[model samples]
Target: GSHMDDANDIRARLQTLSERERQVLSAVVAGLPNKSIAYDLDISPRTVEVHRANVMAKMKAKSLPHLVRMALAGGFGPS
Candidate 1:
C-alpha cells in the first residue's frame, strides 16, 4: 500500500477513539506519565492505564513510541 493509504487508515483508526481515549492519547503524546494523566483528568491511575490500553488497541499502535508517532501524524495535540 502507499503512504496515502496509511494516512487514511490512521485517520479511520483515530475516529474510533472514544473521547476519553483521545484525551489519554493527547496526554501520552505530550509526554505525560500515567499518574500525571490521571491527575489532570481527575481519574484514578488504573483508569488512565485502561484508557491508554484502549487507545493503543484502537490506534493499532505496537508500542508507546509508535503510538506517539501515530498521534502526532494524526494531528492529536494537547488542547
Candidate 2:
C-alpha cells in the first residue's frame, strides 16, 4: 500500500499541472536546455523558464537531478 504512495502523490501532482507544464517537464527530463525546449515548443526562452519553474515546484523536486529520477519513475527519460 505505502509502496504506491510515492507514485500516487506524484501522479496527483502531475494531474494538477497544465498540459504545457507536463510537456515542459518532459523536455527538461530529456536533458534539453531552456532555449532548446523553447525552440521545440515554439515559445520564448523566458516562457520555458516559467514552465520549468512551475513543473519543478509542482513536482516538489529538490533539483533537476531529483526530477530526473521522478521522470524515470514515470516512464520517461533521454529516449
Candidate 3:
C-alpha cells in the first residue's frame, strides 16, 4: 500500500476495498442514515446494508459505532 499523509489519505491508500465500499464509508462518516445514504449515492438500502457489513469487515470493526469512533479517534491513517 502507498504511504498515507492522513487518516482520510490512509483510507484512500488502503488497497483492500472496492470503490463501493469507500462510498459506504464516506456516507457513514457524513452521518447519513442508511436510507439517505442509499439515495445520496444512488444505491439501494439493501445494497447499503450489505456494503456496511463489508465496510466493518474490511476495517476490522466490530460495530458501526465502533468504526465511527475509531475513525474519529484517528485510527484510520496518519493523523
Candidate 4:
C-alpha cells in the first residue's frame, strides 16, 4: 500500500507543477547540473535552484535519488 500510494501521490503532485517546473524536473531526473539545466532552459542558475526547490517541495521528495525514483516511476524521465 505504501509504495503504490506514494507513487500515485507523486504523480498527483507532478500535475501541480508549472511547465517550467516540469522542465526542471526532467533535467534533474536526467542527472543534469543546475547550470546546464539553466543554460538549456535559457534561465539563470539561481532560477533553476528556485524551480528545483519548488519541485522538491511539491513532489515531497526527500532527496535527489528519491526525486529521480519518483520521476521514473511516474514515467517522467529523459528519453
**Which model scores highest in lDDT?**
4
For model 2, residues 4-68, the per-residue Cα lDDT tens digits are 22754665655566765567777777787888887777788899788777676766765676666
Residues 1-79, candidate 1: write the lDDT tens digits: 3222265567566667676666677678788788898777778789978888877765677667777677776666445
Task: State each candidate's clash count.
Answer: 0, 0, 0, 0
Q: What would you estimate as the lDDT of candidate 2?
A: 0.67
Candidate 3 per-residue lDDT, tens place, 1-79, comes to: 3222355544543335665556676677667789998777789989989987877677655677655554554434223
lDDT of 4 by residue, 2-77 (tens): 2323665666666676766677777788888889987778787898888888777666776677777788877776
Of the candidates numbered 1 and 2, which has the greater lDDT value? 1
User: Which rank order by lDDT, best down to worst?
Assistant: 4, 1, 2, 3
Backbone clash pairs for candidate 1 read none
RMSD of each: 3.5, 3.8, 5.7, 3.0
TM-score of each: 0.74, 0.73, 0.65, 0.77
Segments of candidate 1 deviating more than 4 angstroms: 1-5, 8-12, 77-79
Instruction: List pairs with backbone clashes in candidate 2.
Output: none
Q: Where does candidate 3 stray beyond 4 Å? A: 1-15, 74-79
Q: How are the candidates ranked when ordered by TM-score, highest leading?
A: 4, 1, 2, 3
Name the candidate that leads on TM-score.
4
Name model 2 segments beyond 4 Å from true. Answer: 1-5, 8-12
10 residues in a row with least lDDT, candidate 1: 1-10
In candidate 4, stretches whose alpha carbon ends up further than 4 angstroms from where it belongs are 1-5
